[PDB]
């Protein structure tokens, strides 16, 4: 009984600042602190039902506000507190808990300091709807809501140019991903009368039309993938806590989160199994390649999410939903630290977003640099740095399958490729001689910074102790090949880091080497600004201007009534201006009229 | 100290004050609407006996304001 | 030559000789209209009108059908085998062809 | 109950003194609109007739409430205009709205087709005088003549259509009597019987062909922006397509098949032009073509699910497009030109109106269930039961629905405004009230959208 | 559109004709700037300036529709095939899908048993 | 002008050099190598040979043209906050402020009123001085400086005064 | 209650044998919050229920049955058709919400079993397949929008298929 009551408390606590947003009571300067205090107690109230889940208990609740009664349907505000939904809530809340107190230090003394917190709460609420969604109509509220609140957050900085391009593209590529999602709605209603998520587990149909052109097409729009991903580096143009949330716990889960909930459909269909891994094979290396060449503090972390998303797509293709959410939950703790500890450098040395100009040494900054070493090594296959409890479990499970061999070989190169861009934060900018970005640059630790980073360290270290042990698993994967499958996950990180250190030091420590101008680089951006920022917006607007507007919508589609005006006025002139007076002429015409009635028309 | 960038503000802030003053003026029946469920009983599910079909309210369940 | 065509002039109330107003000319007309009866419709149609909309007077058998269906389910389950639908409004039709 | 107090607005404006006028016309209209929601909503299983056939009950029309909602709103934004001119001229063009309100109530209420026709074309007369006068830019007549010679050219074939039905099959009258109607045998002589009933509603509800009636009416502005809301009422004023397709021709859908394909291309090509256009009012004018094109698709499918989305979109578009035109009027009163590129600057100069700009733009897209999610998505779900191919075309349109809204935002979200020196006061107390009176009724429809979509709901 | 080499600083010569060409460009640039300078730097204005170049830009799309199109040639017919043409394209797509569906209802049922919506 | 075209390319070449090299000590090594290449042709003045080198300067530079160059902080175009961080408020909005709120902090309002009265009186004198310049068309290239010392204000007064503050 | 089937009874009993610790975090929080504000909410609900006292019984459900079916009266006449058309629309509106109850029975099965999903239940699965198939054939679902006059033709179309197939075999 306590499970149902305490579940709604977490939902109500996040809406309480929105209830007090509309005047109500006056709060000067305390409004940014009010958001921090609201989520602080929201974490404690969410910890208890997860502790209940380890023991015993599973509950589904509806608010009885069913707005639909249309044709054999009921649609109440449904809240599911089961496994994938239950565990994700305190993980997502603890990630935000640090970001809100981080938002006290970053973006300080602004005229729109209060309005910045307003959209972030709605960015948290809409996600919590998507997590607990048990209706497919309820699922749309979250999946679009997170994608629509991102417009106000990515394009937060009021820029006359370039800043609004990112906010437009964030929904534009998302709405091409919507084509599948809305098709997934229409197929679900016609084939199944139930419409809600509680249907799929009983009388499951075997059809390829639903998950492929549907959930997988939704997984290409939301959450990076290969289909459309030019919105990832552009999103870095906004403030640093915004870019942190989009790529750690919130916007980055929305694509994968749907596929885990629809796990009985993926297991039965064999054609879906292949296409999820075949598209997942291209996501692993192609996006990881872009992290090497692109030299910006924020933009390296932007492409690193999509390379991590490749492994998140493999989990669906291997038919393991239990190990699917475990990677993302630990990924939430990986990049809540990594985004803003690197973001702390940008604010310290004036306003520099490039790794080349940045020279934040380990001796110069004591607190921020320690998080950068731990965070980068956590992404790679490390035995006890929370990497083995998330990344390595997928690699060991993938080898024992009837699935595609080319997709399996491509993932193995990407696991060793993680070591290159992780060291490209350390060796390229942090380590060695400082680049000196500006003469007399001040960098100091603030009281708000210490309370945020140190308490993030608990989440980044104890993630492989709490989440991995308490959650009940299904079917153990580790059994076969001690050197070919089991050792290969750990050896790739060791051989990758050795290859990264040898290649970087050869170019950096050389003095006289001369860089070659001629190179085979299809790596700088991946040639997506040449086709989707140059060709695709042009082709939709050329057909709009050379055709459509200048031919049809103003001339040819109009030419129905002006066609019966230009010919009507010609027929009008043949009666008015015709016969220039004279009684003679009118009486000559009357001679014919009698002859028409007698000869031409047969009547008497 | 600086003079800074200037907006209108006086016309802008007054409208929000003038809007909310008339929300609060009809915010009293909203407060009574809560007490109508509290003080007066809403509805109970019971089988109808053959005596009267409709009196005041014909068929209305939940909220006294519906009747 | 225009002769009499030139007469156009820019006009705006803004704040000059108006203090703070919405209605053009006269402070007495402005306060009694633009803030009172303009916001009286905001209080009656929006706030007092929110009680209606669809909530309260049943609205086309939305709440009535639920009580009607439940008693028909329990009656047909105990006696009959077919649940609700089997042959809808058809009992002995005079042939077909 | 509905007519008579609406007629008493005519002696109200004339008898009242010159200093008042606007106070009496707005306040008295608001209390009549409250009483429309009080009585019309009550219905049984099948909605029973109101009285004798002069004005009848509503079966699937909560769209009458929208006309009552704009009944005071068509006076609020017109306050900036008309004030410079004569006091007698002010009274005349309030009474032309009252006459519009008189005829618009009669169209939706009266359950007829014979007498409905002489109220269908009767709305065109007051709007003609409204459009042909007070137009700031030229070519009023190149839009005024096009306003009639598109509509009347298509609607006069109803005289040879409707009368032909009642002479053979009983009488049209009540529609509640209309069950005498036998299914059409489908022949070459029966082709022009179906076309004449459709072509009348093919003009008011804009397609791909014969669609140029609408942009000319919007770009060449009648009076300020409040009369453009009445032009939105004319789109939904052709609601008889819900009644004719269901009753008069139930078996006929084979001849509907080419007309769906025309409206399907009136979604991609009508949206593409609505991107590179210069005028701020035109970028609402062409988005209103595609939004009402969704309804025409839904009608010709004839599925029970599609009429739910059809009735929703009539109310959805009636309070979102009118909201967008009020924002276009608020920039037209300050900058004195309808150019999008020149009128550039939100938040910095217009701090509170920019939040109203956001709420109006996002409602064109599928937000959390306000009305447009219950409008658009219901049609897309119903098109798959017609044919599987539809969502490949309909999904592309869902991308460009953002490209109406966001392009209107971004091209005004630049805080430059170097050439512009005007727009000192951001918005008057009435101007901000206009924006709230359009979105907040839709925000109340989130709780209960039963009175937003009801053909057997 | 882009060539083999991106145009930014490619092919430039001083000469005599090119030196006077830049003098022609600055002559109009300074002339239109000074009339803006006289309008911007005075408190007596208060309002939005017209600018004849920007009005003619809006007039290019809103007007000049029927003054043009008087030479139709073969270019207009190609635009008609890109407009009225694609409407006839889907006529052999939607009908073929419907004839596929209509045959299934009468013989060899393909529709799902758990279907009731519309 | 020949002198300006060399300087514009040389300014770009130094800033484009730091994208390829990582360390600042290696940057100084290549900077001396670039100086020796251009000083060989700078010694003698040529009309045909020097112009041929200017078109040759586009080559080699274009072969290694896109390694994502660094613009450092707030720069015209490029990357990382071009118009961002500075939202700003126009000077027209300052006078637009309504009473009661304008009464709060009277030091900023009274000082601005004194500057506004001085700008209104100088506007008539500045208009006659601007047309006094010998051109008899409208203007030539750039705006002319003030000749009078007593009246002050060189043509534009609101150009430098009241702009933006971060 | 009565109409809704659901599960008979749930077990739910804790043992707690392994490890001493601080008893249980789930058990301690359940006992604490039951008397903190859950007991106060139960007392406030009882105080308002007792305050009602006098209550109206009311008719609630209305009768009106049969009154001649639509497939008994023919020829276009308002006097006979109107009562018949109201009867069919009454049945159609109820049958829209009949399916909803049977749909909710399948919704109740999915949560209560979870891991079993399709392996058990079977009774709710068979009940849903029988009704929806009958709803698809009899109550439109294919024959356009709702109309009582068109419904008799839809019933005749199904009857014609039964007469043609049985005669051949």
mmCIF file with all atom_site columns, N, CA, C and O in Angstrom, chain F residues 65-82:
data_model
loop_
_atom_site.group_PDB
_atom_site.id
_atom_site.type_symbol
_atom_site.label_atom_id
_atom_site.label_alt_id
_atom_site.label_comp_id
_atom_site.label_asym_id
_atom_site.label_entity_id
_atom_site.label_seq_id
_atom_site.pdbx_PDB_ins_code
_atom_site.Cartn_x
_atom_site.Cartn_y
_atom_site.Cartn_z
_atom_site.occupancy
_atom_site.B_iso_or_equiv
_atom_site.pdbx_formal_charge
_atom_site.auth_seq_id
_atom_site.auth_comp_id
_atom_site.auth_asym_id
_atom_site.auth_atom_id
_atom_site.pdbx_PDB_model_num
ATOM 1  N N  . UNK F 1 65 ? 44.014 23.310 -45.542 1.00 0.00 ? 65 UNK F N  1
ATOM 2  C CA . UNK F 1 65 ? 43.138 24.449 -45.243 1.00 0.00 ? 65 UNK F CA 1
ATOM 3  C C  . UNK F 1 65 ? 42.088 24.184 -44.160 1.00 0.00 ? 65 UNK F C  1
ATOM 4  O O  . UNK F 1 65 ? 41.651 25.121 -43.485 1.00 0.00 ? 65 UNK F O  1
ATOM 5  N N  . UNK F 1 66 ? 41.686 22.922 -43.998 1.00 0.00 ? 66 UNK F N  1
ATOM 6  C CA . UNK F 1 66 ? 40.649 22.556 -43.027 1.00 0.00 ? 66 UNK F CA 1
ATOM 7  C C  . UNK F 1 66 ? 41.091 21.505 -41.984 1.00 0.00 ? 66 UNK F C  1
ATOM 8  O O  . UNK F 1 66 ? 40.837 20.307 -42.166 1.00 0.00 ? 66 UNK F O  1
ATOM 9  N N  . UNK F 1 67 ? 41.778 21.947 -40.904 1.00 0.00 ? 67 UNK F N  1
ATOM 10 C CA . UNK F 1 67 ? 41.985 21.087 -39.742 1.00 0.00 ? 67 UNK F CA 1
ATOM 11 C C  . UNK F 1 67 ? 41.144 21.537 -38.533 1.00 0.00 ? 67 UNK F C  1
ATOM 12 O O  . UNK F 1 67 ? 41.509 21.256 -37.384 1.00 0.00 ? 67 UNK F O  1
ATOM 13 N N  . UNK F 1 68 ? 40.016 22.197 -38.820 1.00 0.00 ? 68 UNK F N  1
ATOM 14 C CA . UNK F 1 68 ? 39.185 22.925 -37.842 1.00 0.00 ? 68 UNK F CA 1
ATOM 15 C C  . UNK F 1 68 ? 40.002 23.986 -37.073 1.00 0.00 ? 68 UNK F C  1
ATOM 16 O O  . UNK F 1 68 ? 40.513 23.705 -35.983 1.00 0.00 ? 68 UNK F O  1
ATOM 17 N N  . UNK F 1 69 ? 40.137 25.204 -37.655 1.00 0.00 ? 69 UNK F N  1
ATOM 18 C CA . UNK F 1 69 ? 40.972 26.264 -37.070 1.00 0.00 ? 69 UNK F CA 1
ATOM 19 C C  . UNK F 1 69 ? 40.404 26.859 -35.779 1.00 0.00 ? 69 UNK F C  1
ATOM 20 O O  . UNK F 1 69 ? 39.185 26.854 -35.578 1.00 0.00 ? 69 UNK F O  1
ATOM 21 N N  . UNK F 1 70 ? 41.296 27.363 -34.928 1.00 0.00 ? 70 UNK F N  1
ATOM 22 C CA . UNK F 1 70 ? 40.926 27.949 -33.640 1.00 0.00 ? 70 UNK F CA 1
ATOM 23 C C  . UNK F 1 70 ? 40.674 29.451 -33.749 1.00 0.00 ? 70 UNK F C  1
ATOM 24 O O  . UNK F 1 70 ? 41.505 30.196 -34.277 1.00 0.00 ? 70 UNK F O  1
ATOM 25 N N  . UNK F 1 71 ? 39.514 29.875 -33.249 1.00 0.00 ? 71 UNK F N  1
ATOM 26 C CA . UNK F 1 71 ? 39.132 31.288 -33.186 1.00 0.00 ? 71 UNK F CA 1
ATOM 27 C C  . UNK F 1 71 ? 39.247 31.843 -31.759 1.00 0.00 ? 71 UNK F C  1
ATOM 28 O O  . UNK F 1 71 ? 38.976 33.025 -31.520 1.00 0.00 ? 71 UNK F O  1
ATOM 29 N N  . UNK F 1 72 ? 39.672 30.975 -30.838 1.00 0.00 ? 72 UNK F N  1
ATOM 30 C CA . UNK F 1 72 ? 39.798 31.244 -29.391 1.00 0.00 ? 72 UNK F CA 1
ATOM 31 C C  . UNK F 1 72 ? 38.469 31.656 -28.696 1.00 0.00 ? 72 UNK F C  1
ATOM 32 O O  . UNK F 1 72 ? 37.615 30.783 -28.508 1.00 0.00 ? 72 UNK F O  1
ATOM 33 N N  . UNK F 1 73 ? 38.272 32.952 -28.319 1.00 0.00 ? 73 UNK F N  1
ATOM 34 C CA . UNK F 1 73 ? 37.035 33.240 -27.594 1.00 0.00 ? 73 UNK F CA 1
ATOM 35 C C  . UNK F 1 73 ? 35.930 33.791 -28.513 1.00 0.00 ? 73 UNK F C  1
ATOM 36 O O  . UNK F 1 73 ? 35.642 33.184 -29.549 1.00 0.00 ? 73 UNK F O  1
ATOM 37 N N  . UNK F 1 74 ? 35.329 34.920 -28.130 1.00 0.00 ? 74 UNK F N  1
ATOM 38 C CA . UNK F 1 74 ? 34.302 35.591 -28.924 1.00 0.00 ? 74 UNK F CA 1
ATOM 39 C C  . UNK F 1 74 ? 34.914 36.273 -30.149 1.00 0.00 ? 74 UNK F C  1
ATOM 40 O O  . UNK F 1 74 ? 35.548 37.328 -30.043 1.00 0.00 ? 74 UNK F O  1
ATOM 41 N N  . UNK F 1 75 ? 34.720 35.638 -31.304 1.00 0.00 ? 75 UNK F N  1
ATOM 42 C CA . UNK F 1 75 ? 35.278 36.095 -32.577 1.00 0.00 ? 75 UNK F CA 1
ATOM 43 C C  . UNK F 1 75 ? 34.173 36.342 -33.611 1.00 0.00 ? 75 UNK F C  1
ATOM 44 O O  . UNK F 1 75 ? 33.090 35.752 -33.497 1.00 0.00 ? 75 UNK F O  1
ATOM 45 N N  . UNK F 1 76 ? 34.429 37.223 -34.612 1.00 0.00 ? 76 UNK F N  1
ATOM 46 C CA . UNK F 1 76 ? 33.499 37.367 -35.743 1.00 0.00 ? 76 UNK F CA 1
ATOM 47 C C  . UNK F 1 76 ? 33.355 36.059 -36.531 1.00 0.00 ? 76 UNK F C  1
ATOM 48 O O  . UNK F 1 76 ? 34.280 35.644 -37.241 1.00 0.00 ? 76 UNK F O  1
ATOM 49 N N  . UNK F 1 77 ? 32.197 35.417 -36.375 1.00 0.00 ? 77 UNK F N  1
ATOM 50 C CA . UNK F 1 77 ? 31.942 34.091 -36.935 1.00 0.00 ? 77 UNK F CA 1
ATOM 51 C C  . UNK F 1 77 ? 32.671 33.004 -36.167 1.00 0.00 ? 77 UNK F C  1
ATOM 52 O O  . UNK F 1 77 ? 32.854 33.110 -34.949 1.00 0.00 ? 77 UNK F O  1
ATOM 53 N N  . UNK F 1 78 ? 33.084 31.961 -36.885 1.00 0.00 ? 78 UNK F N  1
ATOM 54 C CA . UNK F 1 78 ? 33.845 30.850 -36.311 1.00 0.00 ? 78 UNK F CA 1
ATOM 55 C C  . UNK F 1 78 ? 33.021 29.943 -35.419 1.00 0.00 ? 78 UNK F C  1
ATOM 56 O O  . UNK F 1 78 ? 31.929 29.511 -35.799 1.00 0.00 ? 78 UNK F O  1
ATOM 57 N N  . UNK F 1 79 ? 33.554 29.665 -34.228 1.00 0.00 ? 79 UNK F N  1
ATOM 58 C CA . UNK F 1 79 ? 32.924 28.765 -33.258 1.00 0.00 ? 79 UNK F CA 1
ATOM 59 C C  . UNK F 1 79 ? 33.017 29.298 -31.824 1.00 0.00 ? 79 UNK F C  1
ATOM 60 O O  . UNK F 1 79 ? 33.845 30.168 -31.530 1.00 0.00 ? 79 UNK F O  1
ATOM 61 N N  . UNK F 1 80 ? 32.155 28.760 -30.955 1.00 0.00 ? 80 UNK F N  1
ATOM 62 C CA . UNK F 1 80 ? 32.075 29.084 -29.515 1.00 0.00 ? 80 UNK F CA 1
ATOM 63 C C  . UNK F 1 80 ? 31.765 30.556 -29.212 1.00 0.00 ? 80 UNK F C  1
ATOM 64 O O  . UNK F 1 80 ? 32.672 31.388 -29.094 1.00 0.00 ? 80 UNK F O  1
ATOM 65 N N  . UNK F 1 81 ? 30.465 30.843 -29.093 1.00 0.00 ? 81 UNK F N  1
ATOM 66 C CA . UNK F 1 81 ? 29.912 32.166 -28.743 1.00 0.00 ? 81 UNK F CA 1
ATOM 67 C C  . UNK F 1 81 ? 30.365 33.325 -29.645 1.00 0.00 ? 81 UNK F C  1
ATOM 68 O O  . UNK F 1 81 ? 31.328 34.036 -29.336 1.00 0.00 ? 81 UNK F O  1
ATOM 69 N N  . UNK F 1 82 ? 29.662 33.493 -30.766 1.00 0.00 ? 82 UNK F N  1
ATOM 70 C CA . UNK F 1 82 ? 29.896 34.604 -31.694 1.00 0.00 ? 82 UNK F CA 1
ATOM 71 C C  . UNK F 1 82 ? 29.035 35.815 -31.328 1.00 0.00 ? 82 UNK F C  1
ATOM 72 O O  . UNK F 1 82 ? 29.519 36.949 -31.326 1.00 0.00 ? 82 UNK F O  1
#
